[PDB]
RNA sequence: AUUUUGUUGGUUUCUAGGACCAUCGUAAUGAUUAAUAGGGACGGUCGGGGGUAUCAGUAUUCAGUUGUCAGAGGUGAAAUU
């Protein structure tokens, strides 16, 4: 039927990454980030950047033969947060309305099965 | 050592007295509860109680292979990088 890759999307609060990949992964077929498409950086992860950045994206899949993909939506993850930045929402629709079919839906955010120390001290972030 | 042998040392038998030792007989012969105190034993347990080894788990970082290409990082915004 059609032909998949994996979309790779990792959105952090301060960027926003659309990755498509092979199957394995190894091959890289396109990666735009939001921060290609603005030039300030307190909006790099913002939904605008990120929605341009899936279509950039899209329309390299098209021209490489890549129908549809599967997606991987991960956030920062590690010992910082394990929710997904603003972007991230946005790409997924942005992908979806560009005529790129979608496959699976995955959320790989790293987790641990216990944690290293988080920067920041005992006391927080103090603002 | 309490008396007397006419009498003082007497003298050790003697008399009597505790104090013990044995036998026999008397006797209803002789040991308070087990504290909703405690201690201990025992029986099935129950615990992220402790110690010594041992086996996971992803994560973090670093490294090796790859893959593409212009930004990536970070913030309230930036900059150092
Ligand atoms: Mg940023
Ligand atoms: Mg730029
Ligand atoms: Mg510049
Ligand atoms: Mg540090
Ligand atoms: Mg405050
Ligand atoms: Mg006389
Ligand atoms: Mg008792
Ligand atoms: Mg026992
Ligand atoms: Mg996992
Ligand atoms: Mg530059
Ligand atoms: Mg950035």
Do not use: W
Not at 13 to 26: A, E, I, M, P, R
Not at 60 to 85: D, S
Request: charged share 25%; hydrophobic share 35%.
């Amino acid at each position: 039927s059609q032909v998949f890759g994996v979309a790779r999307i990792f959105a952090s609060f301060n960027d926003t990454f659309v990755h498509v990949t092979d199957l394995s992964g190894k091959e890289t077929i396109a990666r735009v980030t939001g921060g290609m498409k603005v030039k300030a950086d307190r909006d790099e992860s913002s939904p605008y950047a990120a929605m341009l950045a899936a279509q950039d994206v899209a329309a390299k899949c098209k021209e490489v033969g890549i129908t549809a993909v599967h997606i991987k939506l991960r956030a920062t993850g590690g010992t910082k947060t394990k929710t997904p930045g603003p972007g991230g929402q946005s790409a997924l629709r942005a992908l979806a309305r560009s005529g790129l079919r979608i496959g699976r839906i995955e959320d790989v955010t790293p987790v641990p099965s216990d944690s290293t120390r988080r920067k920041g001290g005992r006391r927080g972030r103090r603002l």
